[PDB]
Amino acid sequence: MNEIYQKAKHIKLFAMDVDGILSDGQIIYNSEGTETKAFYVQDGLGLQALKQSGIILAIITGRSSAMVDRRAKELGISHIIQGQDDKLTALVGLTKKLGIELSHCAYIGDDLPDLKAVREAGFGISVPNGCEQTRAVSDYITTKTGGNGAVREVCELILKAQNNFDAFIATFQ
Amino acid sequence: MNEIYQKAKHIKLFAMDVDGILSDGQIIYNSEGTETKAFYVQDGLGLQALKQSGIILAIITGRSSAMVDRRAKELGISHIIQGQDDKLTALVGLTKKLGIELSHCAYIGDDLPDLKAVREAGFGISVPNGCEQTRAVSDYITTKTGGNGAVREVCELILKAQNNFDAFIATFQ
Amino acid sequence: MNEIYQKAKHIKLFAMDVDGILSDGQIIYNSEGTETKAFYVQDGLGLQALKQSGIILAIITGRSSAMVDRRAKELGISHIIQGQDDKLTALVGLTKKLGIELSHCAYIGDDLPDLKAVREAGFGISVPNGCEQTRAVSDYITTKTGGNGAVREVCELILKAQNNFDAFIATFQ
Amino acid sequence: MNEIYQKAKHIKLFAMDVDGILSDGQIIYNSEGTETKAFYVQDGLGLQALKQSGIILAIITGRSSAMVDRRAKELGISHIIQGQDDKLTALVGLTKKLGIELSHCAYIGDDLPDLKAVREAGFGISVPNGCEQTRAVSDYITTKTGGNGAVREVCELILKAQNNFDAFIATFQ
Secondary structure (H helix, E strand, O other): OHHHHHHHOOOOEEEEOOOOOOOOOEEEEEOOOOEEEEEEHHHHHHHHHHHHOOOEEEEEOOOOOHHHHHHHHHHOOOEEEOOOOOHHHHHHHHHHHHOOOHHHEEEEOOOHHHHHHHHHOOEEEEOOOOOHHHHOOOOEEOOOOOOOOHHHHHHHHHHHHOOOHHHHHHOOO | OHHHHHHHOOOOEEEEOOOOOOOOOEEEEEOOOOEEEEEEHHHHHHHHHHHHOOOEEEEEOOOOOHHHHHHHHHHOOOEEEOOOOOHHHHHHHHHHHHOOOHHHEEEEOOOHHHHHHHHHOOEEEEOOOOOHHHHOOOOEEOOOOOOOOHHHHHHHHHHHHOOOHHHHHHOOO | OHHHHHHHOOOOEEEEOOOOOOOOOEEEEEOOOOEEEEEEHHHHHHHHHHHHOOOEEEEEOOOOOHHHHHHHHHHOOOEEEOOOOOHHHHHHHHHHHHOOOHHHEEEEOOOHHHHHHHHHOOEEEEOOOOOHHHHOOOOEEOOOOOOOOHHHHHHHHHHHHOOOHHHHHHOOO | OHHHHHHHOOOOEEEEOOOOOOOOOEEEEEOOOOEEEEEEHHHHHHHHHHHHOOOEEEEEOOOOOHHHHHHHHHHOOOEEEOOOOOHHHHHHHHHHHHOOOHHHEEEEOOOHHHHHHHHHOOEEEEOOOOOHHHHOOOOEEOOOOOOOOHHHHHHHHHHHHOOOHHHHHHOOO
């Protein structure tokens, strides 16, 4: 797992799928027409740390909600692409808007729409409950599951590849 | 598990129970008289894929809610029978409305009201936390639990019996 | 576990704790002052079956909510004691209102306020995540956990002690 | 684990992190701009028992919500510090407001902002899913997880160090 650090070493943009990654994949509705989505605290600190080391954060999700916009604002996720199933076009599109190579993009997803972004990114990540064929195509599969530390895990991972992790920890000791 | 593909081979209608199958069986209420129900993302893609291969989707649930109507609309579940505990009459009734044999119906349920629909369908499915006697009567018991990929699993299963799965995957590679 | 059937044989009233028994013990609040509580479908069918065999159902909970009243109405839980921590006085009080002996009362609870009702009932039940000393005092500890089939399990148990279970199942075959 | 009782023996203030400790770390939003947070019943009784033995309770959380204020009021958590990430300054600040030494403070947390409060408290606690470096620095790691009895466990622990537990149990037998 040192060859993982090799691939995360020059990452400048970290892009995330939402449902199944930042959440546990539950889509929650109520009888007054209200939707709800749940996230994980520790993913929050992790993304703030990552972003803090200079890495830019993006969300690319096929679904569309205000709570994705809310979670994103508070963690400094700056590029928020909702209602877009084509993750690679979306991501290549960001590549060009920021002047950053794909080989310096990290992408985490958990299902078929995520497959090509995961395969084509410089660093491609999936989760234990990701679909088999997205997993098969990724550089890394997290130990922690989605909505339960998977994103935190990757955040620590890239921090450590870029020699930025211990220093962030040291901030709290 | 090739004899499972044999039974799913000529399925034209896939019917689902809701609570315990598309959800994890939690019935959620709040102090302002509002009900809520949670579904799983990966079940969503799966049902869209199934429906896409020409299979028609139905919901038959003893309970009645607007969020069942919401989830159904977005996944293209076209026949939505709520407040009906008698699943087999309901299902036989659909049989006749669509001109489709029962032996070409697939049914997944997880409790006693589902038992006869599961036993009488051409392809009968239950889940690990289904009641013992519905399980005992089904052609297949999923590995993934309800509200956690059980429906996705069956969706891939019928896609593969009907030689439609790899092609759907190929759409994302 | 035939000596369990011996104690459930002449039960006429089944009383339940709410939080940790019918729910998984989560107390859920939101930022607009709204409380929510989650129940399990399979517990619902089970309580309807039990009640159906002539057994009367009661709720005794130290907390107080409208969703306890909602869940109770729909399952035919007819006696609903909220904001009462003293479960045994509450239960003895029901004893006298219905002309039914305590030795013919079943009680399930999961924490210290439930301890004496569990110890003094004719049939006393707790759950795996119940506190140690309520468990130590109960005739039966369920396999399924609270808000996840514990109540269903007990319901089947008393049905079977009273030779009423197979017949209820037969209704669905 | 008798050396744990040694450190909890003279505790007079028990301070808690919120997200990941009293909750399971989920941050829940809905499409009408509403946030929700879930707590555990058994943690409630436990904190009431602890407080009852004369111990004063405080919340120190980096996040800010009305449901933290609600949960706190009902359990008698009397000092509620929200929107404050610096837990040790916050806690030392309470030290001085109550005339109580830090060595007589207990602190439970689960992530980096909690690390120094956990290390510097007379009794420092973390949970199984706490970050590695906060855990490494704590006197005790609970068996039960956050939002699932971790706080209850610690509550019983300090009660027992201070010879107050059996007596509290005896109140229910």
